[model samples]
Target: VTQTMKGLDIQKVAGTWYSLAMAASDISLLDAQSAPLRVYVEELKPTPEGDLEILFQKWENGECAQKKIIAEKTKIPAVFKINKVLVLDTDYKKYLLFCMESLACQCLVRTPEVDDEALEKFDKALKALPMHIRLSFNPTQLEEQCHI
Candidate 1:
C-alpha cells in the first residue's frame, strides 16, 4: 500500500459530514446521544511533516466544538491512524472514525445517503470477525437524516 496522503484527495472529501448511520456487532453507548449537529470543516491541509490536518467546527449539544484531526500512518490497513481518522468515501465525502485500538473503537458514517457499497463491505468485515469480538456503537441511521 502507498503511504502518500495524496490518494486520499482531501479536497474532494472535505465537507460537513453529518452522521446518518453506524453499525456495531456487540455493545452500545451510555450517556451518549447522536451529536446534536454535524462536523463543519473550515479547511484541510497537509502538514509539512507529511500527515494531514483537518480543521472543523463540531457541533454538540447545540454548541460549537472545535476539532483538529491529525493523521498518523500505519502499515496494518494501508493508511491507518490511531484514535484520529478521516475516512474518504469512493464518492469523496469525508467521514471520521475514532477509537482507542482494537477495543472501544467506533466510527461515524457521514454522507447524504448510505454508501451501500461501503456499508456492505463494513458489514462483511464485521461478519468475518470472531463472534467473541464485542464492539460499542452509536449511529444516526434515522431515515433520510442528511442534507448533502
Candidate 2:
C-alpha cells in the first residue's frame, strides 16, 4: 500500500527527532527554560494502534501516567486523540497533537538540524516568548533518532 500526506497523518510525521538545543535546568524539568539544551538526531517509533506509558520525575520524585490514541478524521487539520501521539516535527524537534479538543503543541528541542540559519531562527522564536514563561517550561522531549 502507498501512503499519502494528510494534514493529520501526523503518525507518519511522528518519527524521530534530534534534541538540538534547549534551556533546561533539571533533567526532569517539565517547564520551558532559558538556558539552552542541545542534542543530536534520534529515532522515534509510532504505533498507530498502540498506547503510551508516561513516566516523569520531578526533583527526584517519579510519577506515572497512561495515554492511548484513537483514530479520527475531521475537516481543517487531522485530529488525533491525545490517547495517542500523532504529530512530531524532527526539524524543530517538537511533538504536536490535537487531543480530544485541545491543541497539544510542545517544543522538545530548539532545532534538529544544526545550522547557523536554523539555530538563529530557533533563538529568535524562543527569545520572543515572555521570559517568565520560559523560565521552567519545555516542550515534550522526543526521545528517538530522527533524520537529523
Candidate 3:
C-alpha cells in the first residue's frame, strides 16, 4: 500500500467494520483458499493511548469464526503493527482500505456495501499490484454471517 491516510483520525476511525472482500499475495492465505486466515472484521477500537485494538473473526472448516489483537501504532501516523498493515484510506464514516504491506489487502465498509468512489479506489489499487497479490479477489463467502 503506497499512498496512505496522511493523518487518520483514530478517534472517528474506531467502530464496526465489515470485510467486503479480500486478496492476498498467497492464495492459501485467503479463506476461500484456506479457511484459517479468512477473517471477518467486526470492530476496530482505538485505545486511550492510540494503538488500535482489533476484534475480528477467523474462518475455519466452512465457518466464519473469531479473535482480537492490539495493532500497535507505529512511528509513522496511520501505520500499525500486527504484520504492519497500512491504512490506505478512510472516510472516517463509510469505508477503509488497508494492506499488510506486500502480504495482502482488505476492502472494508461500515456496512456490506461501500460507495462507488471507495470501490474505485480499491479497484485501482488492486490493478496496480502484481498478479500474485491480485489473484484471489474473493468476495467474502461469509458476508452475511459476520455480524453475529
Candidate 4:
C-alpha cells in the first residue's frame, strides 16, 4: 500500500485549490473527455466524518460544467475512496501532492504557479509510476469561452 505523507492533516489539505501541474500514466486520460482524471479541481472540503467533498469543473462537449464528488476517507490518513485518492504531501501553504496509484500524480496549489519546490516534489513522486505524462494547464482562455 502507498502510505500517505507523514502526519497528514485533512484540515490543512482542505479548501480551494487548482490543478497547476499533473503527471499521469496514460496521457490520453488527461484530456477533457476523461471522467475522473480530466477534472479542474475547485475545492476540497473536509467533512466532520473526515471524508472529502470535491467540487470541480470539467469540459464536456463544448461547455465547462461543474461537478461534485465525495472521496470517502478510509481508516488510513489521507487515503480515500478505495485507496484511489492519496495525499502524498503538502506544506499547507502553496501546494498539495496527490498520487492515484498507476493513474496520476497531481501538484495542486492555491495560487497556481510553476514553482521549484512543487515541481521537484511532483518529479520525485512521479518516478514511482510505471509511465509518466505531465501537463501544465492555463485555464485563462478556456474559462472565457465557458458559459458556466
Candidate 5:
C-alpha cells in the first residue's frame, strides 16, 4: 500500500491546480490540452462533507473537454477516494494521484508550478509506486515529444 502524508490541509488545497506535466502507459495517450497544448484547473471548491470538488479543463481535438472529480477524504491521512481510485499523497502545492480502471491504471502528477525540489520529492514518491510513463513539465518538451 502507498503511504500518505501525515497531515493534509484540505482547505489550503482547495484551489485551482494546473497540470504541469503528465505521463501515460501508452505514448499515444494525451490528456486534455489548450490551444497551445496546455491543461489547467478551471474551478475547485470544497464540499460540505469535508470533501473537494475538482473541475479541470483541456482542449481535445478542437473541442473543450472538462472533467469533474469529487475527492472524498479517507480515514488515512492525505488519502482520498475519487471514483473508487486512490489519491495517494499531497502537500497542498503538489499531488500524486493514481487510479485503476478496466485493467489499466493512470497516475497523475499535479502542481501549480514546476519547482525542482517539489518534483524531486514527487519522483521519490513515484519510485515507491509502479512504473509509469514519466512526463515532464516543460511545455516545449511536451510539444516536441508528443507533437501536441
Candidate 6:
C-alpha cells in the first residue's frame, strides 16, 4: 500500500485550493477546443458522517460549471474517493487529485505559497503517475505561472 501523509486533519484541509498544474492521458490541449480551461476548489467541507464534501468548479466553453461530490474516506489513510474516477491525497495544506478516466486529469493543488522543499516533494509525486499520461504543464514553472 502507498504511504499517505500522517496525522491528516480534515478540518484543516477543508478549504479552497488553487489549481497549479494539471496533466492527463485524455487532454492533448489545455482547453476543450471551444474555450479556455481552468479549475479550482470553490469549497471543501467535512460532513457529519466522516465524509468530505467538495464543491468543484470548472471554467470552460464560456461557462462555469459546478459540481458537488461527497468523498468517502477509504481504508487508506489521508486518501478519499468518489469512485475510482476521483481520488484525493492531501496533508491539509497541499493536495494531489486524480480523475482516472473519462475526463481524466491529475492535478496539483495547494494554498498560495509553497516552499521549495514542498514543491520538490510534489514534483516527486507527479513523477510517480502512470507512464501512460503525458503532462502538459511544467511542474517546476507552476509557482510562477499560476500565481494567486
lDDT of 6 at 7: 63
For candidate 4, write residues 35-102 as lDDT tens digits: 44767788889999888889977777666788898889888877888438888889988988887754
RMSD to the hidden true structure, all candidates: 7.1, 9.9, 3.2, 2.9, 5.5, 5.2
Report lDDT (CA) for all predictions. Answer: 0.40, 0.31, 0.72, 0.73, 0.50, 0.52
The number of the candidate with the highest lDDT is 4
The order of the candidates by lDDT, greatest first, is: 4, 3, 6, 5, 1, 2
lDDT for 38 (candidate 1):
37
How well is each residue in 33-143 modelled by candidate 1, as lDDT tens digits?
A: 333223434455655444556675544565556678766645432244735343423344434432232222223345445555655544444454432333222333322
- lDDT-superior candidate, 1 or 2: 1
Task: Tell how far residue 1 is off in model 5, in angstroms.
Answer: 4.9
Error of 3 at 112 (Å): 2.6
Candidate 3 lDDT, tens digit per residue, 34-99?
A: 444566778999988888998987655666566788999888877998768788888888879888
Better of 3 and 5 by TM-score: 3
Per-model clash counts, in order, read 1, 25, 2, 0, 1, 0
- TM per candidate: 0.44, 0.33, 0.82, 0.85, 0.62, 0.60
Candidate 6's residue-wise lDDT over 49-114, tens digit each? 668887766554555566677888766546667644344455556665544333344445665543
Off by over 4 Å in 5: 24-43, 58-61, 85-88, 93-112, 139-148
Higher-lDDT candidate of 5 and 6: 6
List the pairs of residues colliding in candidate 4: none
- Judged by whole-model lDDT over C-alpha atoms, candidate 2 comes out at 0.31
- Over the stretch 47-100, how does candidate 2's per-residue lDDT look in tens digits? 555322222222221222222233443342343343333332233234321111
Off by over 4 Å in 1: 1-20, 23-31, 34-45, 55-64, 74-77, 80-110, 130-148
Q: Where does model 3 exceed 4 Å of error?
A: 31-33, 131-143, 146-148
TM-score of model 2 (CA atoms): 0.33
Q: Tell me which of candidates 2 and 4 scores higher on lDDT.
A: 4
Clashing pairs in 6: none
